[PDB]
Amino acid sequence: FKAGSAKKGATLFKTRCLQCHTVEKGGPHKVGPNLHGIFGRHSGQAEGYSYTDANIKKNVLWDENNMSEYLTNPAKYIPGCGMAFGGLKKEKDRNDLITYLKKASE
Amino acid sequence: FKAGSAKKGATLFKTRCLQCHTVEKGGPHKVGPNLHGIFGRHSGQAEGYSYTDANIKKNVLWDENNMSEYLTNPAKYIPGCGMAFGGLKKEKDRNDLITYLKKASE
Numbered sequence: 001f002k003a004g005s006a007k008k009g010a011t012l013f014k015t016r017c018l019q020c021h022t023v024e025k026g027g028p029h030k031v032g033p034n035l036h037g038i039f040g041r042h043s044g045q046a047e048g049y050s051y052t053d054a055n056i057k058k059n060v061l062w063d064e065n066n067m068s069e070y071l072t073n074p075a076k077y078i079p080g081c082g083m084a085f086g087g088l089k090k091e092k093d094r095n096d097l098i099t100y101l102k103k104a105s106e
Numbered sequence: 107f108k109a110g111s112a113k114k115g116a117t118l119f120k121t122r123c124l125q126c127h128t129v130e131k132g133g134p135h136k137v138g139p140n141l142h143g144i145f146g147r148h149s150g151q152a153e154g155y156s157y158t159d160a161n162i163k164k165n166v167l168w169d170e171n172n173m174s175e176y177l178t179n180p181a182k183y184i185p186g187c188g189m190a191f192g193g194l195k196k197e198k199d200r201n202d203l204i205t206y207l208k209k210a211s212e
């Protein structure tokens with residue numbers, strides 16, 4: 001991962017993630033967990049959310065690379081429902097998004 | 107609605123709701139919101155969850171009848187994903203479940 005446009009990323013997040021995730025500090029959980037402070041913890045540790053994916057529950061240390069990989073698969077399992085579009089297949093895309101998430105999640 | 111078996115209801119909840127909802131006091135949010143104290147508020151007011159369905163967001167006063175109706179439709183929209191099995195089509199079923207939810211949500 002190499003920094004990109006936080007500005008493009010912000011639009012990515014609003015159009016592809018924000019329907020399931022907030023990022024503001026102390027923001028509420030929705031279908032997915034609030035993501036504030038995501039790059040200072042492991043996976044599966046948002047306060048007041050309880051997780052389903054076995055790998056997220058092993059508590060991976062979130063960094064840029066790990067996250068880029070995580071978001072690479074266009075589909076994602078939404079418990080009890082099925083597969084949803086939760087990924088950016090394009091590299092450039094993730095670099096933009098992750099650049100925004102770093103900032104806005106802090 | 108007429109009280110039924112909280113015992114049957116408990117099994118219903120564990121097998122059909124618990125994958126998306128907890129009910130214990132102070133229990134965490136998941137795909138759906140924690141439901142503790144559900145019959146003492148309106149819809150769309152769980153602390154630390156942010157909702158999507160326009161009708162839930164109008165804040166309906168949850169009672170037995172309203173809830174039975176709510177759970178009557180076998181399918182339910184899970185934001186960003188699609189339709190999921192979130193209902194009990196059978197009357198007897200809901201009466202069992204709602205009887206348990208009254209107790210366990212308190």
Ligand code: HEM
Nearest residue numbers: 016017020031032043044046051052053084086185186187
């Ligand atoms: C590109 C857009 C998105 C990004 C970058 C993103 C990011 C993340 C991250 C980082 C996690 C792990 C959080 C943690 O470990 O605490 C997560 C989990 C989750 N996301 Fe997303 N997400 C996106 C889109 C979506 C969408 C559209 C949905 C729902 C339709 C969603 C639902 C979920 C759920 C349910 C979990 C928890 C999974 C589980 O418990 O098994 N995400 N997401």
Ligand code: HEM
Nearest residue numbers: 079080081122123126137138149150152157158159190192
């Ligand atoms: C019979 C089983 C279930 C019962 C009785 C039930 C009950 C409820 C109730 C009472 C609400 C409104 C909560 C409130 O107003 O605060 C709710 C909302 C919700 N439920 Fe369930 N539920 C069940 C199954 C499921 C399943 C299986 C899922 C996920 C696949 C789920 C996901 C949701 C979501 C996402 C919301 C919020 C909807 C929105 O924000 O638009 N439920 N449920």
